[PDB]
Amino acid sequence: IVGGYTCGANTVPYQVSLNSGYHFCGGSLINSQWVVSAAHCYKSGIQVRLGEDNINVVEGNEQFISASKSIVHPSYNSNTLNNDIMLIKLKSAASLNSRVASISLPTSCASAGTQCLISGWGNTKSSGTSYPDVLKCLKAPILSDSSCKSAYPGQITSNMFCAGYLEGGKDSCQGDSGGPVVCSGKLQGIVSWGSGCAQKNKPGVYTKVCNYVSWIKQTIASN
Template identity: 65%
Template sequence: GMRLFLLLTLLGGAGILNLGVDSDVRVALSNLHGIFNPVRSNVEVRLGEHNIWEHEGTEQYIMSAKFIRHPDYNSRTQDSDIMLIKLSRPATLNSFVRPAALPTKCANDGTMCKISGWGSLRASNDGSRYPDKLQCLDAPLLSDDTCFNAYPFQITENMICAGYLEGGKDSCQGDSGGPMMCDGQLQGVVSWGHGCALRKKPGVYTKVCNYISWIKNTMASG
């Protein structure tokens, strides 16, 4: 399942977040507003997690060593909403913890992708309900025009949209930082969107393929 590519962090027990694992297993890829908390410079990263309330014997708990946010991150527009988290020690790779592949190129419109996380299954005004087990959703990538029309003047070249314009299925609250895997490659991390599965309001993801050189250079320089 998709849990192979997920990490889970609990910031002070308040937010449930997940991050895609990058090709260097000591580094996790996330987005900024999901996890960046200046008060806490170290978080516990959980790998191999599936049911967050049960110890299943597959988990690895590793403290973060360093947060590296993208220098162009804009908190007003959410542009370049991407960061790397260096782990304090290497993870052990096995059938439950496996690195996700970085994209070799950007994905085409209409590509079906897997989005996963432990976010709320309902919008918060309906009373949030967080699942115990990892949730997974298949959703298509939408064209830049469709994305822009859904969110006029809010979409930058570093964002992609995925989901269904008819609504009803989308990533949701608490999924910030969740990975979007397309053809086995990490093409997006959940960035923002209006509420949960709203009609004509697809989810917005940081476009990972625009950041391949930054990710590789940052990892190489440690």
């Protein structure tokens, strides 16, 4: 996250870290056994870390749970990042408490101008590299589809939206991928892509979760 703030310990209780020997992507806990992330975060041998604030220190609230299966969206296109969404099932159920809690899926798509909360452990610089150990947060509005398509001509599908600041300076970034965009207390987006981080006229692009709710519900009910 570039230009954001320190969330504060366990104030984003649905945020997870995906760990393959190191943190590599974020995700969101949607119930006690399932995490949503980005398909471009796929790898084998994922461990899901819940209840994290400082990813480099054991603080006492964490639950570390191996993934039993990963399900990438059947229409995911790694070239265009269309349908950049994946489900991860945990080998055993998480214990839900005040520090580890699920986020609701949307019944409805969010509106342009809605302020959302984006979070993660990704790079905090627009130029250069500095990774935080504690969870960072950013509030950002959803942009109109026309300003989104203007920013990334020919690259925005109906399964994507833009959120951020056309002036630049504030954005998600590498390492935030897979993480939550929460608007009005529902998961509306997944950190997906963008051109650099926090660049002028290049806002963040997010998977539009409201398009996937049927697939998520059907998949969880059969796996």
